[PDB]
Write a protein that binds this ligand. Structure first.
Ligand SMILES: Cc1ncc(Cn2c(C)c(CCOP(=O)(O)OP(=O)(O)O)sc2=O)c(N)n1
Ligand SMILES: Cc1ncc(Cn2c(C)c(CCOP(=O)(O)OP(=O)(O)O)sc2=O)c(N)n1
Ligand SMILES: Cc1ncc(Cn2c(C)c(CCOP(=O)(O)OP(=O)(O)O)sc2=O)c(N)n1
Ligand SMILES: [Ca+2]
Ligand SMILES: [Ca+2]
Ligand SMILES: [Ca+2]
Ligand SMILES: [Ca+2]
Ligand SMILES: [Ca+2]
Ligand SMILES: [Ca+2]
Ligand code: NA
Lengths: 525, 525, 525
């Protein structure tokens, strides 16, 4: 067998059947004779390729396979890799290298010092020392991406390797099963459970690895047993809990002092599947108030090491959430009372308040919709106004890097063909990965894109006001016609200048058979 | 509080009470006002510092703390770090940096691009962005070294940081408890146990992480229940099993074909706490023969990813060994029969065969002796001839790097003051870290050093014969007087030119109140 | 031809005829069939291998070739590489890798992520993608080490590559000539010369790259023409000027304020072949006083970029010094007056003051002696008391890393067989690379080693007094018998407890036919 044949057999035997890619010269010997059982999803720029693959991996809860061109293609994807690192996304990033005989001379298209290029944003990065090693290196990449804590990996392959003879012993790779589905030993788990059972006023904080594990329902059981309020850890990349469950208390503010104040009076705070904590604004004060202790369950040693407070347990979130939910006592305390619905903001017949947009989406979208957020000044209102009952219902750029949601929404829609995806993206953020629209059109992936057009980088403008910063340049983005951009890439487009038009546009979009972009005129901040 | 006071409080609260070091100018602000409850162990070169700390950490089963001088001191230690990486040794390596105000100009003693220097041989490498961050960075280092898979970490600290004010919120670091003591979920563990129970001819292979976990006795129970032969994985850094137990079958040959032949006819091979596998010679063939499947339990994702065959489970070795030992059925098969004792090799009244040396050590040493091996051509005979009943009884350079055993034997003896340590080191290997002898003399650490003097790099000479390689230079090391070197560093020294003198020297050494070096004239290969 | 044959042909065609090494398993396929026209110099530990090669390269003014074993051997050498980086030493560091077929599994002796290991201490670091690339990669290593700014480079070679067929087009590598012997363009050089000619009170500062270029005599002509005092830049690794020439003013203090005060009243300060500046103690103040401007000529862009003041020219030091010496006008100012001889320090019939030692060496050594310094508390007195008339007469660890001088003195003596080398090394520093003594004995390289034994790390103790630091541990090194260590490695040894014995020992040592170590009892600080 050839290295080509052996590698595609390994991929299919390990459950991989889709290549997200943007091709080049070094990759044609890999992509030729493309197997009939595989799908190739083309995107027009590599940030888009990786964003689409990332949304697909996050929603599918399985690794996604990517093929990019050498250094320039890998480089174009590295902002997308920063988000993927923070979201623990299992991405197998492959890139083609020059033929081994011209690597030394640094021929055009040589990826120099290739494995160092995507560092520090990958768990493992490698270029094999010979063609016959390629299947084994691919096996390593698959497992490294997939073991907890999941994350992106990188493999560079000289183009001449694919046609070489494979090692016959590579067949031992095909069916390897690798598990990290582990939980705390019984003795120590009993100690943890007793601490939870004897807490007087416990609180629960959940992060994105809960949703990645599909541990959401176990966390609901846990919260109901403990009678405990539940918050989502700050800077949330995913939604780990039903947002209208009576225990839910919303998105935590991303500040040190704000969080310790919020937790004051809670004697035990159990954090599951989050860093402790992804603060953002610098809000100095106590990490925890006297009387509060913290216990973190995390899949990632790096998170356990860097927490500034609390105990930690490094284990699989699915296994730990299930064990805790099933072992804790039912507390006789009263179940928390649901948060009240948000107020309606006054809305005239002109430009839309973001609150109106979210309320209207909540009114009209299916109950199993999936939302993506890259409307950076409106995140708090989004979290208050969307009833997200099911797992896998929310994605936000985990490193804060814009350019994620537009492509990721396409990948999520590909992963979840029966759940309507609605990406709510600011006019600023929409440009970073605008060409991803073309992939939705070409493959007829029916994502709905809601562009919140207020003419400015509002989250930045707000922060400039916060620092009392005068004369900051570059904050306004006038003069973009999103309906024309959508037409450019073959996506149906609508415009909503007021609430009547927003309702009419959403009705059409929800009825449509393909992707749709709605440009919404929103209030300037 | 100062950063100095806060950092020593963190260290003591995390169980650290000893600094292994070789000082410099950038480290004096850390070492000043040295706390009365801490011990400083000086060694004269940094390979020695780290080797001593490594033996201490491996035998104690807890992290060891190291302080080195800037780039040159760190650099002198990097061969020792290669061994520590392979042995999963929890080493906290700190080095002093120039004052922040002259880092930019690259004053003498600046460690340029410091965190990159020890890569790729550390799990985590860092220099803090401000003085107040130092305690938090130290906390990260402690936990990163200590979580599974354990390993060395690196922290560079500008010398001016120590006298600065600490953050009052650093007190939350002091008592953090971080656990990685995890095992496979119940459902999947039951599947594994059923596979073991239904095996017709199981085999067990154990590696160094068994001994690191003190899982040895659980592995004995497991082997007795399953009625299974037990081998030690190749290139063994530790001894994970009693070597005269009836199930024991010795050290596996470090070759692909040799191992698959050895395992032929075993239907299930359970590997615990080893890479799969640390081969050495290139002995191409089948990874496993038809009819054999492999299951690996490893604490290290990197090991699970790179195995060329078998299933894997990434979990804590202590927790997994205990769970398996207690869950498997007692098989009705007959217990394996003990291996026969090794034959006595003919020995005249002249230079010693290595086999004679090992038999004599086995005859005379206490039953709880601890051996170290850096006599590289005699490892197979050592493994056959020493009855090692207890855990923590054997250490060998895990990366194959010479210069480990002499210093490590001192650290092991410091960790285990009631167990006599006997380091068996070739005349070649003894030179790499020869100055470590001084630390044994100064602190009166009563290690016995047995120098196997055959005048040559025998393991290399043997391999040159294997490749039929003529005219290889640099293989002979004549003209070293080890008794004079021992005198140079204050260690009592003896010479044994024949068996009568070997017995007499060992009797004296075993009676002595301090370290002793015995130079043994061994047969030339 | 094989890769082996082609690579040795490239080496000999590029002037390389000596391999400094410590062998291992991965290197035997390179070292076998060792060519008859090459020399192999064995040392017993890799810090020693690289130190010897470094002294040889620095004194020869040509690249030196090194062969080490995999990661552990490379790692053992990295403190030596820190010094080599600072001294711009042209070192070609090669290390053997595992056979390509087991790199993936990480067999014992695999150097993982090899090229990253010696970073950041090398100019270029590489492992070739195929066997046929090895000669081209070796060519790159040779030229990268040798082009300005010279420095160490690293090449990792899988052991199976050597026996493979070479590319017939590799013959084009053999005779390549690469030059960096460049100087500032005529127009700008004329501007510089006019600035020097019109200076009212110029000063010259010289660094180690002057001595590396053998630009010393040109710098003497330049100083005589300009009538300018000459200082050596701080932390000096080499001696760039005759120390009793009337212009010489000695070693600059390694402090910011001290240097600006020293230069006050000099209108133009021309620095040649030094960083600006290798400060050590933090002595904050003005970089230059009003009225002084600085112009630096450096071979190293990194030095030009990081200077905190002055203009810079990046060019070859040999070419620039020759051009300036020959173009400047003869000033009509009076030639500077020679510094007075140093005073005799009072000396009783007991332990030796360092000043006595240096005065006695100056009295007894040949005029063409070469000194090395690793007596770290006595550097200022050494610089005052040794008349060094010739180039290549002084070496000091350029990164401040101890363990350089003992091995380097052997390499220097090998490079300069007709100049007596005298290494003055403290009792502390002597231990770092003590095993290098064996190479001097085995090859009969007649270096004289003068061990200044005061029982302590005096340079550190002095600095602790400076910070008023109480309770610093690890500063004393009692209990080392250097005559026994010398006997251990086959070197003749003498002891000098007083001046009479010092004179008698030096007389013997100077008469001896082999290496000699003299242990000198010096006054405790
Ligand atoms: C790749 C990238 N570039 C720039 C930014 C900075 N950035 C920018 C440019 C933001 C403004 C996005 O504007 P928007 O129109 O999408 O939404 P708002 O008006 O609601 O903020 S928020 C933010 O952090 C970023 N996070 N990531
Ligand atoms: C740091 C380092 N340098 C060199 C080697 C190479 N090496 C060397 C030099 C060996 C010979 C050791 O000789 P010995 O006298 O200690 O023992 P034997 O004579 O029994 O081999 S075995 C081996 O792998 C190494 N492994 N590690
Ligand atoms: C590799 C390394 N380790 C440690 C040091 C720190 N160091 C040490 C240990 C010195 C003392 C050397 O003592 P000595 O006996 O050689 O000489 P003095 O007594 O004259 O200082 S000076 C100095 O910077 C260093 N520079 N390099
Ligand atoms: Ca509503
Ligand atoms: Ca906007
Ligand atoms: Ca016996
Ligand atoms: Ca030997
Ligand atoms: Ca004199
Ligand atoms: Ca001293
Ligand atoms: Na490095």
């Amino acid at each position: 067998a050839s290295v080509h044949g052996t590698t595609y057999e390994l991929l299919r035997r390990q459950g991989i059947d889709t290549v997200f890619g943007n091709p080049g010269s070094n990759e044609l010997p890999f992509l030729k004779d493309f197997p009939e059982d595989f799908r190739y999803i083309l995107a027009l720029q590599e940030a888009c390729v990786v964003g689409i693959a990332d949304g697909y991996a996050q929603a599918s809860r399985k690794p996604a396979f990517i093929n990019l061109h050498s250094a320039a293609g890998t480089g174009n994807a590295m902002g997308a890799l920063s988000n993927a690192w923070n979201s623990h996304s299992p991405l197998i990033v492959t890139a083609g290298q020059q033929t081994r005989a011209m690597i030394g001379v640094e021929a055009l298209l040589t990826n120099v010092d290739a494995a160092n290029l995507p560092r520090p944003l990958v768990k493992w990065s490698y270029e094999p020392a010979s063609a016959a090693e390629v299947p084994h290196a691919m096996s390593r990449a698959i497992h490294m991406a997939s073991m907890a804590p999941q994350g992106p990996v990188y493999l560079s392959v000289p183009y001449d390797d694919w046609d070489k003879d494979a090692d016959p012993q590579s067949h031992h790779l095909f069916d390897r099963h690798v598990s990290s589905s582990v939980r705390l030993n019984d003795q120590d788990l009993d100690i943890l459970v007793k601490a939870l059972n004897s807490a007087s006023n416990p609180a629960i904080v959940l992060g994105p690895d809960v949703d990645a594990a599909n541990a959401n329902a176990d966390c609901v059981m846990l919260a109901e047993r403990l009678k405990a309020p539940v918050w989502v850890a700050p800077s949330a990349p995913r939604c780990p809990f039903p947002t209208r469950h009576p225990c839910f208390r919303g998105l935590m503010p991303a500040g040190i002092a704000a969080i310790s104040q919020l937790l004051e009076g809670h004697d035990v705070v159990l954090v599951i599947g989050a860093p402790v904590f992804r603060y953002h604004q610098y809000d100095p004060g106590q990490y925890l108030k006297p009387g509060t202790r913290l216990i973190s369950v995390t899949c990632d040693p790096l998170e356990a090491a860097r927490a500034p407070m609390g105990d930690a347990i490094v284990a699989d979130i699915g296994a730990m959430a299930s064990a805790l939910a099933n072992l804790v006592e039912e507390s006789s305390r009263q179940l928390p009372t649901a948060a009240p619905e948000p107020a309606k903001v006054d809305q005239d017949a002109g430009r839309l308040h973001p609150e109106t947009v979210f309320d209207t989406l909540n009114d009209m979208a299916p109950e199993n919709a999936i939302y993506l957020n890259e409307s950076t000044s409106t995140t708090a209102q989004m979290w208050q106004r969307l009833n997200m009952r099911n797992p896998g219902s929310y994605y936000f750029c985990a490193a804060g890097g814009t350019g994620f949601a537009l492509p990721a929404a396409i990948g999520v829609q590909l992963a979840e063909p029966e759940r309507q995806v609605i990406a709510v993206i600011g006019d600023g953020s929409a440009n970073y990965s605008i060409s991803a629209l073309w992939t939705a059109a070409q493959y007829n992936i029916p994502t709905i894109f809601v562009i919140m057009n207020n003419g400015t980088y509002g989250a930045l403008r707000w922060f400039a006001g916060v620092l009392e910063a005068e004369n900051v340049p570059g904050l306004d983005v006038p003069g973009i016609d999103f309906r024309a951009l959508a037409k450019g890439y073959g996506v149906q487009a609508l415009k909503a200048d007021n609430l009547e038009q927003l309702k009419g546009s959403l009705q059409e979009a929800l009825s449509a058979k393909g992707p749709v972009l709605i440009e919404v005129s929103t209030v300037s901040p």
